Amino acid sequence: RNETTNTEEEKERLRKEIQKQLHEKIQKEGLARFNKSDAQDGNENHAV
Amino acid sequence: TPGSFQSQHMQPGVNCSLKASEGQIYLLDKCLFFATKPCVYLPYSGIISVVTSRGTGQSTSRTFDIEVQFSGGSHTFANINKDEQKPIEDFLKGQGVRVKNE
Amino acid sequence: NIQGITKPAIRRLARRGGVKRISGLIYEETRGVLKVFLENVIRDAVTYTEHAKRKTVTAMDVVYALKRQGRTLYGFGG
Amino acid sequence: KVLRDNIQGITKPAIRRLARRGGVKRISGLIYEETRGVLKVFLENVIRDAVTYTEHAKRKTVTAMDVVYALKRQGRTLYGFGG
Amino acid sequence: SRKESYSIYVYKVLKQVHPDTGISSKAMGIMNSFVNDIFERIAGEASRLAHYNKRSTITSREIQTAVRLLLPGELAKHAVSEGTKAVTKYTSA
Amino acid sequence: RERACMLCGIVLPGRVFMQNGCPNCDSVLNLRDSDQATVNECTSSSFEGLVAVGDNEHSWVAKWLRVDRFQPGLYAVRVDGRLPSDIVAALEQYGVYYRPRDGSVI
Amino acid sequence: KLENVFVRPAPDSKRVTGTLFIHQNGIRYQSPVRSDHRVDILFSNIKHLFFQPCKEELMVIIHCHLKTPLMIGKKKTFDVQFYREVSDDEDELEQEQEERRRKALLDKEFRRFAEEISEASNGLLDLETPFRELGFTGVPFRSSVLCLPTRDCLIQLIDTPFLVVTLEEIEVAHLERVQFGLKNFDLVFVFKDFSKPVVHINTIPIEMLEFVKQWLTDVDIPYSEGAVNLNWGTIMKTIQADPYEFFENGGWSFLGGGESDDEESEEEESEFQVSDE
Amino acid sequence: ELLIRKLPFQRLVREIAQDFKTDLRFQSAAIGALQEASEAYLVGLFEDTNLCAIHAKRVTIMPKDIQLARRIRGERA
Amino acid sequence: LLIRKLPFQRLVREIAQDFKTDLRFQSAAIGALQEASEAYLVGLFEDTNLCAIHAKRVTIMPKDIQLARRIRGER
Amino acid sequence: AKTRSSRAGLQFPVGRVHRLLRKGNYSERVGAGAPVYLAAVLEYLTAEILELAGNAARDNKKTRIIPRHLQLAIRNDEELNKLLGRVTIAQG
DNA sequence: CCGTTTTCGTTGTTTTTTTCTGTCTCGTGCCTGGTGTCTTGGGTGTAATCC
């Protein structure tokens, strides 16, 4: 069992590495989606 | 106000369910009162008999049920703690109510 | 042999338990629960029997197996 | 000196924090008192046994092993403090 | 006297299992409590069996069937195999 | 509601047979230890000829009805229905011969 | 055409069986009792097309999840479900075998019809089926239900209200209540469109935690775990007010904080693996 | 009185037991004790299930009620 | 531990003041009591959360606690 | 091989277990392989637990095992948690 | 039981800032109302046994 838990946990290190690459990817794709010019053009929403 | 009834826990009433509604039953000197929607007032003068079921056969039911029979129907109060059975029976016998134990 | 626990028997057990209305899957659920319970108890009893070097399962094995689970039973020689 | 009504030392945040560790999102206001009563009844049941052990050993100090045996009697075995 | 505990044995087992891992003092307290608890359970059940069968000796069969009762399936199988192996080799030696 | 035990011929309420079993046939039928199907197969509510026996030993009727070795009580001259083949074989295993009281066999 | 079909949501307060027809640019449900209770669904407006056979169910289902909501009777809906129901010792075992035949018959017919809908769409619509073996129990609304993954979505179709979560629209998943020996946890989906409300799935059994974490990783969805139910009504309104400042300060990548960052431990006893006396 | 028929329960017991050791014998009192314990257990479980069902403001017991009762007891993980 | 160490100590002493007057306590007795109490309460809150979710709710109410203690077999 | 542990290839003390079984009031007599069998079982179980505790401490990038890792190991193993379902772990 | 060592429990004081709270608006979920359709009762009606 010890060599299988080592193997399963190395697959779990790959699981964590993927999760880290997903958080870094979304951080880069949130900074690219929103620019400082859109923040300057802030739209104030008013009750109709 | 609350009557001379005191639960095993020295409380003026007992937790019970009437159908799907959880609530509190008060044994007052002249009447049984259930204070939880729907509110139920039962005067002792209108009660024909009280039937107590502690399992209706094998297997000890931790929580027992009280069926109050009166001239207009019956009300089953369920999920009463078994420790409260003797105080309730002795009080109802003291008020002149006919208690039946299946 | 698990179909021998018919629907009326489960209904009877629920009525003695105070149950007013019963779903349709309750029967299969109850059969599964009973099977698990019986599996554990009979496994313990057979362990006791094998240890006693017997081929017959006595009432003492069942009583000790229930005492093992915490389900102490009176009236069978305990 | 006698201690009087120290149950309110289980302030609202302790009970709230205990609920959050338990996974509770929204907490009714009647819970805190409910919980307090429950805890009282628990401790009174455990302490009465621990004290029973302490008094039987003809001692005057409640030791950790007394608590451990009191818990073990209720099926509350505790690892970390001896055993 | 010097209190008895299973700490050195747990160090030995740990180094056998994880040479590059260490145990805190509190984790060793927990492990000692666990070992004592398991010993108490097994000895009590062995005594119960011996009394059930009107015997006055605890032999490896009582301990084996106690392990069969207490442990779940795979745990029981492996622990029984380990114990029989160790007893066989101690007898042989 | 009353039913007549097929084997011994006694008549008792069906719920009595279910709850307590036949006081005479329990040594070979185990009616109390039997389910409702077996109770019906050994106790029938369709019968005829209510019989009350006071003294089994000296009553010629009891000997004629072969109930002189049973508990006094309500008995039926004729009972509708016979014992099943499996129950017949089980009784034959015990060495007891079953004579039907249905009247069709004489 | 597919005959003897019930529609959800119903166009009238009375449950009536209808016929479903395939046309050139969509499908039409038509009740036999009233011509005015027609429901028309264009292929261009279907986002997802699900089929669900009677693997444990008393019912067979063809579900259309829509891009734009339709007004069926008095109700606005994104979801239109078409369904039929199977419901109506060896003899009882044989009656189960006869029910298994009736299941397989309705399964084959409704699967074939859902494939024929996909064909009629000229490749605009893929037919999805739930992976039952990957299903987990949870509470998205008010009842415990089996949530079923598909190729592209997380679904629940048996009970109303329906759950349809498109996996591609998820920005992040948060696992709430996850901590030391906990009985159950909650799962929260945040969408890429911050105007869309977050979806909660409650009471997922803790036994399914490692499976759900694996499944989210296999689908390329980032996840985070927390001991406390974080409020999203607050989180979202702040994020909607300035999405740029949110990502500037670390978005959700900083919130994740996977690094255990624990070195204090609890000291150590004299390390001595030697037999004493 | 026992609410399960005796022969079905005996057949079930023998079927289950046959998966641990062939040619096992059971005293009739063992089967009786097993039946008493099983019915007592099932009645207690049905009482807890009824309590759960009434708690949810319903009258019909459901499999989710059973699973919740068994989880709260500490029987299912 | 979420509860503090001194209010809990005072509570424990106050409760212990009924069974024998002027009782001393030991190094690891109050700590063990606090660990057991918090573990017990966390388990109880788990069961209460399960019941509250069962009722289609998210707020735990005293009747859920009562149901949990009833099913556990607590008096 | 003087010590009885060596003659059985064990790390736990056979002699101490023998003394505790005798001076413990369990039965009139004790076998010769019951202490050996019990020591083997105990050593196996401790190794079983320490493997998973080491795994959990290595998943948290920690060199020392603390009560947290023991709690994780126990509550994450189906069989161990079933064995230890009624056990509270301090600081777990 | 009696003498030894020295840990950590009890005692008190100062400072920090997270938690408790007063206050407001909104909403979501608790509670009242309208409705389904099933299991079952009370009754008519046709038809009958019994003496």
Ligand SMILES: [Zn+2]
């Ligand atoms: Zn008879």
